[PDB]
Amino acid sequence: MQILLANPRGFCAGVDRAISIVENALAIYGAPIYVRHEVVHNRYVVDSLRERGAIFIEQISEVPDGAILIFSAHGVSQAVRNEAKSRDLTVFDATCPLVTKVHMEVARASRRGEESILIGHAGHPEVEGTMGQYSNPEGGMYLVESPDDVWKLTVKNEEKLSFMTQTTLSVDDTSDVIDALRKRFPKIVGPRKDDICYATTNRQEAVRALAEQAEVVLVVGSKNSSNSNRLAELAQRMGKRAFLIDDAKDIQEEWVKEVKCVGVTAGASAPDILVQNVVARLQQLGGGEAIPLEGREENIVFEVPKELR
Numbered sequence: 001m002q003i004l005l006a007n008p009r010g011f012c013a014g015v016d017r018a019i020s021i022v023e024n025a026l027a028i029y030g031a032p033i034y035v036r037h038e039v040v041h042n043r044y045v046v047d048s049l050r051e052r053g054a055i056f057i058e059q060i061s062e063v064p065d066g067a068i069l070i071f072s073a074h075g076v077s078q079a080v081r082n083e084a085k086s087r088d089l090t091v092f093d094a095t096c097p098l099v100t101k102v103h104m105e106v107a108r109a110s111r112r113g114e115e116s117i118l119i120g121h122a123g124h125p126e127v128e129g130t131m132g133q134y135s136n137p138e139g140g141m142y143l144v145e146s147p148d149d150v151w152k153l154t155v156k157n158e159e160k161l162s163f164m165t166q167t168t169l170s171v172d173d174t175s176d177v178i179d180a181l182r183k184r185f186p187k188i189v190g191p192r193k194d195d196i197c198y199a200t201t202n203r204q205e206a207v208r209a210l211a212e213q214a215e216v217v218l219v220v221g222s223k224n225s226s227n228s229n230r231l232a233e234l235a236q237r238m239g240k241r242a243f244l245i246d247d248a249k250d251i252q253e254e255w256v257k258e259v260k261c262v263g264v265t266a267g268a269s270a271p272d273i274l275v276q277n278v279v280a281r282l283q284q285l286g287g288g289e290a291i292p293l294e295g296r297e298e299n300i301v302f303e304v305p306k307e308l309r
């Protein structure tokens with residue numbers, strides 16, 4: 001059995017920064033360090049940081065006065081930022097810069113009172129944080145997930161309308177949604193393509209190349225990772241069996257029995273150790289040396305705030 005490894009895979013620049021923000025805060029200030037939401041949607045990273053003294057909360061009212069608070073990579077609404085601001089907290093912001101970029105545009109549209117449409121998945125913390133940048137009652141902020149959503153949306157003034165996207169979407173599905181928006185609202189303004197980040201685009205492109213070669217694709221990542229789920233979905237849509245797994249213990253032998261070629265990748269929030277252990281388990285089930293596929297080079301790094309070292 002040939003084990004193939006997707007390239008690029010695993011940590012992106014935002015996730016490396018965000019985890020380093022929490023670890024450095026723990027090292028500089030000691031436990032506890034409060035984090036609003038899982039810093040990244042990975043169970044291994046999250047359990048790890050919990051055992052080291054980070055406490056993960058959903059609301060600022062869970063956080064004691066005087067505490068250090070870090071916002072997760074996904075970002076936070078103005079309401080949350082202000083509730084934190086109004087309380088007695090030292091705040092470090094681990095929001096990915098590439099999320100912050102979208103935030104600034106929704107804020108712009110809000111200040112103008114011009115309506116904005118977000119493409120994204122209801123209930124995801126990044127969507128809550130992005131929708132949460134708009135506050136002007138004179139305009140409006142709308143969520144669409146699909147072409148059918150666009151087909152039913154009415155806005156107040158379609159001569160002044162813009163759109164933004166969640167950073168972790170399916171590149172192909174988002175393209176359908178944008179085509180629908182431009183047909184329904186011919187004057188809508190957006191970025192040249194979308195707000196899907198470099199890391200989501202690359203890892204999708206990588207998993208397409210993997211799925212071309214592999215009968216079975218394992219995507220290392222947690223159930224609540226949006227970008228990880230998009231990798232598994234892409235492979236499955238190409239007619240390959242695909243599984244999203246937290247770690248090597250999730251592997252069922254039937255998945256790989258009599259399979260000549262298995263592919264492995266990882267979501268942007270999955271550490272490389274998890275992938276090494278998955279390969280190790282596939283080697284127990286008959287795999288050889290893991291072969292990495294050639295991939296698009298990534299060279300972006302995002303530094304932690306100077307205050308955190």
Ligand SMILES: O=CCCCOP(=O)(O)OP(=O)(O)O
Binds near residue numbers: 040042
């Ligand atoms: O939210 C932007 C991406 C952050 C890193 O990946 P993670 O799996 O934690 O988040 P998700 O892909 O947004 O659900």
Ligand code: SF4
Binds near residue numbers: 073097197198199
């Ligand atoms: S997946 Fe993209 S937007 Fe999200 S943390 Fe990583 S680089 Fe930033």
